[PDB]
Enzyme design. Structure first.
Site, short mmCIF file in Angstrom:
data_model
loop_
_atom_site.label_atom_id
_atom_site.label_comp_id
_atom_site.label_asym_id
_atom_site.label_seq_id
_atom_site.Cartn_x
_atom_site.Cartn_y
_atom_site.Cartn_z
N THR A 1 30.66 35.66 50.18
CA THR A 1 32.29 35.29 50.12
C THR A 1 32.20 34.99 48.66
OG1 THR A 1 32.39 34.66 52.43
CG2 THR A 1 33.86 33.71 50.66
N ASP A 17 38.05 36.85 48.89
CA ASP A 17 37.63 38.09 49.53
C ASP A 17 37.94 38.29 51.16
OD1 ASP A 17 34.49 38.67 51.12
OD2 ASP A 17 34.99 36.86 49.89
N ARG A 19 35.78 39.43 53.37
CA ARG A 19 34.56 40.10 54.35
C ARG A 19 33.64 38.61 55.03
NH1 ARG A 19 29.64 43.68 51.87
NH2 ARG A 19 30.99 45.52 52.35
N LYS A 33 40.69 33.71 54.23
CA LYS A 33 39.84 32.78 53.48
C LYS A 33 40.62 32.00 52.90
CE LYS A 33 35.56 35.62 53.65
NZ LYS A 33 34.66 36.25 52.91
N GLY A 47 31.05 29.30 53.04
CA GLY A 47 30.17 28.65 53.79
C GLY A 47 30.20 29.10 55.23
N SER A 129 28.95 33.22 47.66
CA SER A 129 27.93 34.00 47.38
C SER A 129 28.08 34.72 46.17
CB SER A 129 27.63 35.04 48.36
OG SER A 129 27.23 36.20 48.21
N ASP A 166 28.34 41.77 44.54
CA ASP A 166 27.72 41.04 45.72
C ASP A 166 27.50 41.82 47.04
OD1 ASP A 166 27.54 39.45 48.31
OD2 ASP A 166 27.38 37.56 46.83
N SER A 169 29.95 39.84 49.93
CA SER A 169 31.38 40.10 49.31
C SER A 169 31.80 41.47 49.56
CB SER A 169 31.72 39.50 47.84
OG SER A 169 31.33 38.06 48.02
CL LIG Z 1 34.32 44.55 54.25
#
Ligand SMILES: [Cl-]
Ligand SMILES: [Cl-]
Ligand SMILES: [Cl-]
Ligand SMILES: [Cl-]
Ligand SMILES: [Cl-]
Ligand SMILES: [Cl-]
Ligand SMILES: [Cl-]
Ligand SMILES: [Cl-]
Ligand SMILES: [K+]
Ligand SMILES: [K+]
Ligand SMILES: [K+]
Ligand SMILES: [K+]
Lengths: 219, 199, 244, 204, 213, 216, 233, 230, 238
Positions: A1, A17, A19, A33, A47, A129, A166, A169
């Site tokens: 994230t 993002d 994901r 998010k 988190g 992340s 990442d 992410s």
């Molecule tokens: Cl994705």
């Protein structure tokens, strides 16, 4: 994230993002998010997904209640403190790292709050992340009093950096712009990757599957 | 983290650095660790960020009420005791050392160390991870009755050296001066920072 | 002056004319008790109490109405002595709590404020009755100077230069008005305290009495303590001979 | 793993004005299987179903405790529950046990009462909601189910074709999991009817 | 972490006769390799008829003796009489067991007289299992004191000895001899030996010096 | 306290004819680091008893205020009764054992000197509740270094004058500074007598380093 | 209306004084302390011949060496009796001995004024016990008899009577008591006085008799044994 | 130190009537008049806000209060008691939203709020509320109007009036109110019912009025009230 | 009256009747006399019998080795206060290892007895005590009442006809300080004698004596142990 916050002249901008990963496998490719707290205050959650969701909704609910009793536009400084004390009570067991940004009588404000209850106030930050990638961009290309459009572009770039660099992410980049005049939430602001295309059609003629038992209830 | 408090005749000087770090990564290179308990009372933050901020808030709250009940600006000793008490009640649960320094009419500028839940008054105090590297410096560089400006040099110098030695200390130096007249808050940027032997 | 049957049994009940009679009847208990006195001098505070001897079998010094609340704070009580001792214990714990929390001797005003809140709390409910006594608090320091406070059954606290509670509180206050306490030393004050007690005392209604006296000033280094036998007997002789 | 103890596989798919939900029929402890006809999909009303994969006790417990709260909802409210509302009800139920959770990952599949609209979702063991326009999977063969669904699913499927796709996705994903199988039960949900089918799955 | 216990050494001994009871102990209090004090007798008066000897963790011994002292008063105010040797022994068992899951690291031996005037000795473990016996040793050197008493007082492993009844004179020398032997070998035993004699007349104390190394 | 932060080393005590003398260095150590080299580890309870403490300094300061309040509370009554040196020792034993039994101990080792009714008092209190009386006392490393010295002098001469006790203590502080890594050359001397408690200012033991040249 | 813990202008608790009046309705019970034992006697007060004879238990066993006679409200008594039995066995467990007759009576007397409304537990007593008790037994201080009432006041008695006809039986014991009486005369006297103050004639099934003497334990008399003591009318 | 009474202050009389509830009903019947009208495409709520002096700041306190985005409240009776019910209703609305993630149905709020009112008719040491509530709401594309009273009972209304002249206000509405009104027409007949019991001249400060529709619930600004007063 | 049913109700005169009604319970109990010298503190009480067949009631009770009491009023309230006094003395010896000063124990009675007089539903203690003790300040005679108020006294008498004893002690209060122990008890007995009617005098069955001082711990003499004190008696005069 990867989530980031940016402060500019007319207000603030928050990015995230889309994901969500379960184990090391992707469960949701399109999750939100960026969280509603107040009409002009939003929070970015990284988190434990359940923790970020529930903590956020709790704050939002309390903030609405506060606004109702107060009769005034809620303060972001108020939101930050509420979050800290709740999170501090749980000694970091509520895995919520959050970026909260909003506009006040006091101007545009950006806060970051950690699951243990620490908070810090700053012009720009990134959590999650992919924070390393996002902070790098902001550190590289951040000037104070950026025009909205330059701010929009930099934030996207910062979050995009996290997506590609990442593994936890991915997906589209969502942005939320908060100005004294309004707050414009732009879902799927930019999508780096689009693969709709499939080369094979895996369809089955009815009857291919062997059925032992059939029962139908009409309504 | 490197925090410092120095005592002079007119009042006190409280110093800090700007960095918080999570292991080997820094999460905030611009953090003000100087929190006010009251109009004339300040504290310097070290240890767990969450724990330190949590104590700072409660101390400011209790002292605010204390002030109103007495209808007088709280004694610094009083301020120091509340912090000591919170730290001691939860020594195992809370990881923080707070240096509380300020000014009151009764006893002037005073410096208190609350590390571990003890109370001690000192001519000057240092705290944090960075303090280890400057114990020698402060012992040799201290003179009684330094003027406000001499005190500022002293805390700035010590913290600068600690910052360069320490990995957990960095950023800019935050400085406050507490006197009967008011609170002076200043920041020293990297370019302004004192230079010594680097290599 | 009083309402019967209904409006005076509970402290949680207002009378039609906006009065709480349970507090007022508790205020009557102190009015029946013997007179307690205390005045603020230039360099401290002096207390004086007439202690009516119920029986000659009791010890000289029994039924002490002058208390040590804190090393620097003294209490002078008038009313139901049972309640007076419990309030002395409440005041002692409050001064102890302040030092445990803040690390220094409690300011007298704040101590008076804190204990008055506890007294007031007993005037609101049917579950408890108001305290049947009134008491005075005196202290001295170099910073705050001489201070004197008095709390009554309702929970009201005020600062005083001169104060009296009990049987003849009016006969005492008019005698206090004569004194230039703002300029008088506390050594001179003791003499004048002793004589006002003797004038106030009714020798033809009440049988006999003992005189209690207290220090709290510069001569005692800021500590509240008892006036010695030597100085008291000088003040007692002064009281008897200026009574003519 | 605690989830691996009993195993299980639950899957839901979306189509043209219809939804499908399927689960394996196995009840077994680590080394051995006990029952061939174990229930994992439970009806939360006409045209709305919940599938539960994980620890068999918590699978049964959550289903029973959700029915407790569902019936009280349907009695206090003068209506039948909306799919979004059930998702939030399960989310609240699971999150209440944040630091002592039920070891089950639920899957809601059903059509919205009144408004016909299809709805599919899956949740955490601590109650985190996931809404998609295609498919949701839960169980010990998550990776196997994901691999099938991504390759087989199409945007607009009729009830005839949706059943074939969701079955083949379940059949082959289960055949790669050692703790899932002993038959597959499929529910196809339409406005007019509900079709229940047990498939000729591998019994090894 | 943190240990709530410390080993302080000390050995306690008790022997029962026809009209007497003997409680004896060393005066050494130690911790690790150092000696805390050379003047620490383990014998303690409870009543004119009963004496207790505590050994092990001194922190527990001090608290336990104070509990018994308070419980002795509580009994006599409620029952209008002194608590008997057997009753104190029965009480100590319940007090020690109330701490079954956080025990007193303590070795108690009670010595006194029963209601018939005869000598009684009660031996305890840290948890509260007890019984009456003729003689018992408890503590760091209990394994050194026991076998000699089994042979001499119990007449064990002997063929044609006429089985002479135990006298106070012989028991006193037996008490002294075993402790002198124990002080030679056990490092925690030494300094001085205090002997408490329970008779119909009352409690009499006697002190004999031991090795101070 | 589970883990002590700032600690103080050995505290000394020995009773002479007409009183008791106690010594403790003014050091508060954070591990091996000498953090505070001018902090008092000794307090005056009242006019009859005094107290020096080893171990955690925060726990000592807590016990300092609790005992301090108890003397204040007793002085307010003014009933002609005061806490005897034995009574303080008895209270402290009960306090330490109570905290120990709750598995939350006060990390302290105490030496209590006192003079009452023409008799000298010297009492030891441990963090586990171990308590006793001795003519001479030494905690921590003092028990291994200073205590052997005190016992050997008291064997040859049981009764000492105030001067003899003082110079014996100064001799012991010299040994402690040489052999304890957690000690410092800045100490205090407290004395109980018929006149009361007297704590003397910063003292330094005379050191000799001539053996530094005896290695060739 | 007043509370349960209200003092009279006289200086007594109303609920206690009223509990004493509840005894004056209960059946008469007599205890006699002889130098060689203690005897207890009580009338059963039969309301109907359909009621079982040995069903009414107004004299009970508390320990092997202690007996207790009750009068007043029987329901309240058996709550106090069970507590007395618990106390004896709690003391046996802790001290390995039998309790004294005085200590047992004192233990019951501790529950006396433990009643109230406010500042009390949810299961706390609302009122006193409408019971008077006669504890008769033998300990190491010889044979003893104790009397207890709702006020909590307990005292030793050489001979005492409690119930409806308390004063009538008290005066009859007053003139027919020697501190050197025999146990044979002790049971005789209690039987003689019992028929005088009763509304019904003395039958073998009409009364309860108990003896506690140094030699043998507490004994409940059997119908055949009662007929041997009623033979000497 | 205190500890509350554990006995009911509302009990059954020999007639079988809970007197304290009817006595609480007298408190609302004597309070300032309030009126609510359900009007096909929305709901209107209006009340008399006559503070009886020019010293008062008419903008400081409000009688028509929002509970959430889609629900509003008006009252007749005592102000202090009404405030407690507002704060309780606002919490109940959020408690529902946190669990179900859906705007609370008006019928479900009134049921939960009326249940709170029921408690004070049976619980110890407390008197019932001296307030009758008028709850409006919009859910499932439908207007809702409810009445809650001291009893804890709740009623669904097309149009009703409470407070001073509530009997004359209802009979007026029986003749004046017709189903299938427009929202803007409903404000008129709300102020008209309020004029029947007013006494004095009407300004935008003298009265308070809130509206509820598909866009949510809001209180009308003083400028908007003036335009309808012609 | 309506101001006399609860302790929490103040009378218009400024009094609490329930405290005064509890004070009546003390006067109804049999008389007890307490007096002290410079070395000893003596309690002398009159045992009472409801009937001649019943034994005499206990008047003197043990508290600690240095403190003893004599009761007047309700038995259960006396035993309840006695157990509190015993517990406080036990706690003092458990913690400090030294006997609890008499002055402080009576102050704890004053604090405890005050609590129920100010709370609704509660009641005052229906017993008055005479406390005889010995500590660092010498012998002490203390007096407690249903009202939490307590007195330090040279000599005192409470109960039925205690006025007669009170007047006797008031005449001979200067005598007590230099009195021998045997002479001190006789003064206490002669005071208690004044309480009884002219027909009857002090017997071996109705007299209980308790003595504490510098010489010995608190001891209660009752029957055969009492006769040495009664023998050597100046005859009852009028
Ligand atoms: Cl994705
Ligand atoms: Cl430093
Ligand atoms: Cl630090
Ligand atoms: Cl115990
Ligand atoms: Cl303990
Ligand atoms: Cl009776
Ligand atoms: Cl109630
Ligand atoms: Cl009596
Ligand atoms: K929150
Ligand atoms: K001064
Ligand atoms: K009574
Ligand atoms: K009256």
């Amino acid at each position: 994230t990867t989530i980031a916050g940016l402060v500019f002249r007319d207000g603030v901008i928050l990015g995230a993002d889309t994901r969500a990963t379960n184990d090391s496998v992707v469960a949701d490719k399109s999750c939100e998010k960026i969280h509603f707290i107040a009409p002009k205050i939003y929070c970015c959650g990284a988190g434990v997904a359940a923790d970020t969701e529930m903590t956020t909704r709790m704050a939002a609910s309390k903030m609405e209640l506060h606004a109702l009793s107060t009769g005034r536009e809620p303060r972001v400084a108020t939101v930050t403190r509420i979050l800290r004390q709740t999170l501090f009570r749980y000694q970091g067991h509520v895995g919520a790292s959050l970026v909260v940004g909003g506009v006040d009588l006091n101007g545009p404000q950006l806060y970051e709050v950690h699951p243990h209850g620490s908070y810090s106030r700053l012009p720009f930050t990134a959590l999650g992340s992919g924070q390393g990638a996002a902070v790098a961009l902001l550190e590289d290309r951040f000037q104070p009093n950026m025009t909205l459009e330059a701010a929009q572009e930099l934030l996207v770039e910062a979050i995009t950096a996290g997506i590609l660099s990442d593994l936890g992410s991915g997906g589209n980049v969502d942005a939320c712009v908060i100005t004294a005049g309004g707050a414009k939430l732009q879902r799927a602001l930019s999508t780096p990757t689009e693969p709709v295309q499939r080369a094979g059609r895996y369809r089955f003629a009815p009857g291919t599957t062997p059925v032992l038992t059939r029962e139908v209830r009409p309504l | 983290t490197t925090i410092m408090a120095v005592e002079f005749d007119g009042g006190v000087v409280v110093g800090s650095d700007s960095r918080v770090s999570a292991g080997t990564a820094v999460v905030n290179r611009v953090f003000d660790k100087l929190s006010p308990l009251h109009q004339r009372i300040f504290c310097a933050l070290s240890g767990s960020a969450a724990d330190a901020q949590a104590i700072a808030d409660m101390a400011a709250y209790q002292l605010e009420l204390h002030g109103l009940e007495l209808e007088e600006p709280p004694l610094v000793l009083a301020a120091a005791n509340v912090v000591k008490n919170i730290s001691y009640k939860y020594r195992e649960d809370l990881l923080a050392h707070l240096i509380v320094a300020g000014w009151d009419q009764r006893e002037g500028g005073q410096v208190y160390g609350t590390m571990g839940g003890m109370l001690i008054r000192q001519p000057f105090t240092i705290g944090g991870s960075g303090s280890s590297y400057i114990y020698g410096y402060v012992d040799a560089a201290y003179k009684p009755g330094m003027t406000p400006e001499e005190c500022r040099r002293f805390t700035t110098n010590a913290i600068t050296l600690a910052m360069n030695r320490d990995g957990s200390s960095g950023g800019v130096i935050y400085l406050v001066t507490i006197t009967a007249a008011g609170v002076d808050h200043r920041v020293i940027l990297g370019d302004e920072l004192p230079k010594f032997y680097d290599e | 002056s009083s309402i019967g049957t209904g409006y005076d049994l509970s402290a949680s009940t207002f009378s039609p004319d906006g009065r709480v009679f349970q507090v007022e009847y508790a205020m009557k208990a102190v009015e029946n008790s013997s007179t307690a006195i205390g005045i603020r001098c230039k360099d401290g505070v002096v207390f004086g109490v007439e202690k009516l001897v119920l029986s000659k079998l009791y010890e000289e010094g029994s039924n002490k109405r002058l208390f040590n609340v804190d090393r620097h704070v003294g209490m002078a009580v008038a009313g139901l002595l049972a309640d007076a001792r419990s309030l002395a214990d409440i005041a002692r714990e409050e001064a102890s709590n302040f030092r445990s929390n803040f690390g220094y001797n409690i300011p007298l005003k704040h101590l008076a404020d804190r204990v008055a809140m506890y007294v007031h709390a007993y005037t609101l409910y049917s579950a408890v009755r108001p305290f049947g006594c009134s008491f005075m608090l005196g202290s001295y320091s170099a910073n705050d100077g001489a201070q004197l406070y008095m709390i009554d059954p309702s929970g009201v606290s005020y600062g005083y230069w001169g104060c009296a509670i009990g049987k003849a509180r009016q006969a005492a206050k008019t005698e206090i008005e004569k004194l230039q306490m703002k300029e008088m030393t506390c050594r001179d004050v003791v003499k004048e305290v002793a004589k006002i007690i003797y004038i106030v005392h009714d020798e033809v209604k009440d049988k006999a009495f003992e005189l209690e006296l207290s220090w709290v000033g510069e001569l005692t280094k800021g500590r509240h303590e008892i006036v010695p036998k030597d100085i008291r007997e000088e003040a007692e002789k002064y009281a008897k001979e200026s009574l003519k | 793993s605690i989830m691996s103890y009993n195993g299980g596989a639950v899957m839901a798919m979306k189509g043209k004005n219809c939804v499908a939900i399927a689960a394996d029929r196995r009840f077994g402890i680590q080394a051995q299987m006990v029952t061939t006809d174990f229930q994992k999909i439970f009806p939360m009303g006409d045209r709305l179903y919940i599938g539960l994969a994980g620890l068999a006790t918590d699978v049964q417990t959550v289903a029973q405790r959700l029915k407790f709260r569902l019936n009280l909802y349907e009695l206090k409210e003068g209506r039948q529950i909306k799919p979004y509302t059930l998702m939030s009800m399960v989310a609240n139920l699971l999150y209440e046990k944040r630091f002592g959770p039920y070891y089950t990952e639920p899957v809601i599949a059903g059509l919205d009462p009144k408004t016909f609209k299809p709805f599919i979702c899956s949740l955490d063991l601590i109650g985190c909601p996931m809404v998609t326009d295609d498919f949701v999977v839960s169980g010990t063969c998550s990776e196997q189910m994901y691999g099938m669904c991504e390759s087989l699913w199409e945007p607009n499927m009729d009830p005839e074709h949706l059943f074939e796709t969701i079955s083949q996705a379940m059949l082959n994903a289960v055949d790669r999991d050692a703790v899932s199988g002993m038959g597959v039960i499929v529910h196809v949900i339409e406005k007019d009817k509900i079709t229940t089918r047990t498939l000729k799955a591998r019994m090894d | 972490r943190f240990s709530p216990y410390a080993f302080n050494g000390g050995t306690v001994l008790a022997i029962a006769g026809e009209d007497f009871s003997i409680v004896a102990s060393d005066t050494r209090l130690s911790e690790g390799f150092s000696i805390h004090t050379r003047d620490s007798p383990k014998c303690y008066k409870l009543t004119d008829k009963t004496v207790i000897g505590c050994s092990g963790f001194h922190g527990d011994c001090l608290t336990l003796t104070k509990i018994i002292e308070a419980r002795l008063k509580m009994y006599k105010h409620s029952n209008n009489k002194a608590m008997t040797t057997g009753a104190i022994a029965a009480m100590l068992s319940t007090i020690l067991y109330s701490r079954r899951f956080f025990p007193y690291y303590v070795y108690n031996i009670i010595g006194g007289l029963d209601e018939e005037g005869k000598g009684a000795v009660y031996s305890f473990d840290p948890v509260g299992s007890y019984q009456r016996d003729s003689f018992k040793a408890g503590g760091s050197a209990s394994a050194m004191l026991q076998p000699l008493l089994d042979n001499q007082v119990g007449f064990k492993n002997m063929q044609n000895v006429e089985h002479v009844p135990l006298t106070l004179d012989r028991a006193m020398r037996l008490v002294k001899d075993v402790f002198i032997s124990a002080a030679e070998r056990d490092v925690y035993t030494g300094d001085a030996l205090r002997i408490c004699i329970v008779t119909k007349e009352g409690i009499r104390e006697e002190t004999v010096p031991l090795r101070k190394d | 306290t589970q883990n002590p932060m700032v600690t103080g080393t050995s505290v000394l005590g020995v009773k002479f004819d007409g009183g008791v003398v106690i010594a403790a260095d003014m050091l508060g150590s954070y591990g091996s680091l000498a953090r505070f080299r001018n902090i008092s580890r000794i307090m005056r309870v009242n006019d009859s008893t005094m107290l020096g403490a080893s171990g955690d300094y925060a726990d000592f300061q807590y016990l300092k205020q609790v005992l301090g309040q108890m003397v204040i509370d007793e002085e307010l009554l003014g009933d002609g009764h005061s806490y005897s040196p034995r009574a303080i020792h008895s209270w402290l034993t009960r306090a330490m054992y109570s905290r120990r039994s709750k598995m939350n101990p006060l990390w302290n080792t105490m030496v209590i000197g006192g003079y009452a009714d023409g008799e000298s008092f010297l009492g030891y209190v441990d963090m586990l509740g171990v308590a006793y009386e001795a003519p001479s006392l030494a905690t921590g490393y003092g028990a291994y270094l200073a205590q052997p010295l005190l016992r050997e002098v008291l064997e040859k001469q049981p009764v000492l004058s105030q001067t003899e006790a003082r110079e014996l203590v100064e001799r012991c502080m010299r040994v402690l500074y040489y052999r304890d890594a957690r000690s410092y050359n800045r100490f205090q001397i407290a004395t109980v007598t018929e006149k009361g408690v007297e704590i003397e200012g910063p003292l330094s033991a005379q050191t000799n380093w001539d053996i530094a040249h005896m290695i060739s | 209306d007043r509370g349960v813990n209200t003092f009279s202008p006289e200086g007594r608790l109303f609920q206690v004084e009223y509990a004493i009046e509840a005894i004056k309705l209960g059946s008469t019970a007599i205890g006699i302390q002889t130098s060689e034992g203690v005897c207890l006697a009580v009338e059963k007060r039969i309301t109907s011949p359909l009621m079982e004879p040995s069903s009414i238990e107004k004299i009970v066993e508390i320990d092997a060496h202690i007996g207790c006679a009750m009068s007043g409200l029987i329901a309240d008594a058996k709550t106090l009796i069970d507590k007395a039995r618990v106390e004896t066995q709690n003391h046996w467990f802790t001290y390995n001995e039998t309790m004294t007759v005085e200590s047992v009576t004192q233990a019951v007397s501790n529950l006396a004024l433990q009643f109230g409304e406010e500042d009390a537990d949810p299961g706390a007593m609302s009122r006193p016990f409408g019971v008077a008790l006669l504890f008769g037994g033998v300990d190491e201080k010889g044979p003893q008899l104790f009397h207890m009432d709702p006020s909590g006041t307990f005292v030793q008695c050489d001979a005492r009577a409690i119930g409806s006809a308390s004063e009538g039986a008290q005066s009859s014991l007053q003139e027919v008591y020697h501190k050197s009486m025999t146990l044979k005369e002790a049971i005789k006297s209690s039987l003689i006085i019992l028929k005088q103050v009763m509304e019904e004639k003395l039958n073998a099934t009409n009364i309860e008799l108990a003896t506690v003497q140094p030699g043998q334990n507490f004994h409940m008399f059997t119908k055949e044994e009662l007929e041997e003591v009623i033979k000497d009318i | 130190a205190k500890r509350g009474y554990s006995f009911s202050l509302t009990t059954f009389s020999p007639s079988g009537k809970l007197v304290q509830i009817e006595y609480a009903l007298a408190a609302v019947a004597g309070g300032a008049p309030s009126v609510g009208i359900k009007a096909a495409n929305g709901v209107v709520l209006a009340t008399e806000k006559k503070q009886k002096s020019i010293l008062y700041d008419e903008r400081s306190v409000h009688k028509v209060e929002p509970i959430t985005k889609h629900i509003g409240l008006v009252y007749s009776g005592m102000g202090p008691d009404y405030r407690v019910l507002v704060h309780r209703a606002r919490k109940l609305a959020q408690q529902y939203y946190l669990v179900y993630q859906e705007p609370i149905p008006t019928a479900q709020l009134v049921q939960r709020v009326a249940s709170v009112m029921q408690e004070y008719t049976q619980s110890g040491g407390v008197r019932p509320f001296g307030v009758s509530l008028l709850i409006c709401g919009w859910n499932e594309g439908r207007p809702y109007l409810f009445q809650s009273d001291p009893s804890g009972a709740y009623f669904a209304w097309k149009a009703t009036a409470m407070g001073k002249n509530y009997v004359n206000g209802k009979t007026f509405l029986e003749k004046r109110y017709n189903e299938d009104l427009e929202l803007e027409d409903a404000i008129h007949t709300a102020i008209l019912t309020l004029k029947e019991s007013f006494e004095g001249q009407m300004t935008e400060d003298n009265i308070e009025v809130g509206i509820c529709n598909e866009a949510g619930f809001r209180r009308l600004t003083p400028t908007e009230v003036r335009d309808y007063l012609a | 009256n309506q101001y006399d049913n609860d302790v929490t109700v103040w009378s218009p005169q400024g009094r609490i009747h329930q405290i005064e009604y509890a004070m009546e319970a003390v006067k109804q109990g049999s008389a007890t006399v307490g007096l002290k010298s410079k070395t000893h503190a003596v309690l002398v009480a009159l045992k009472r019998a409801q009937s001649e067949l019943a034994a005499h009631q206990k008047k003197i009770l043990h508290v600690d080795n240095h403190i003893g009491i004599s009761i007047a009023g309700l038995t259960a309230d006396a035993r309840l206060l006695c157990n509190f006094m015993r517990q406080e003395c036990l706690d003092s010896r458990f913690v400090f290892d030294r006997p609890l000063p008499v002055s402080r124990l009576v102050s704890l009675i004053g604090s405890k007895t005050q609590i129920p007089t100010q709370r609704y539903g509660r009641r005052p203690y229906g017993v008055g005590l005479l406390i005889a003790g010995y500590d660092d300040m010498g012998p002490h005679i203390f007096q407690t009442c249903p009202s939490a108020n307590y007195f330090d006294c040279r000599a005192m008498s409470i109960g039925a006809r205690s006025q007669s004893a009170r007047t006797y002690l008031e005449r001979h209060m200067s005598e007590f300080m230099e009195c021998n122990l045997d002479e001190l008890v006789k003064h206490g007995l002669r005071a208690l004698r004044e309480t009884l009617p002219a027909e009857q005098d002090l017997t071996t069955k109705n007299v209980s004596i308790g003595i504490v001082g510098k010489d010995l711990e608190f001891t209660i003499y009752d029957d055969d142990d009492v006769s040495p004190f009664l023998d050597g008696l100046e005859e009852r005069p009028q």
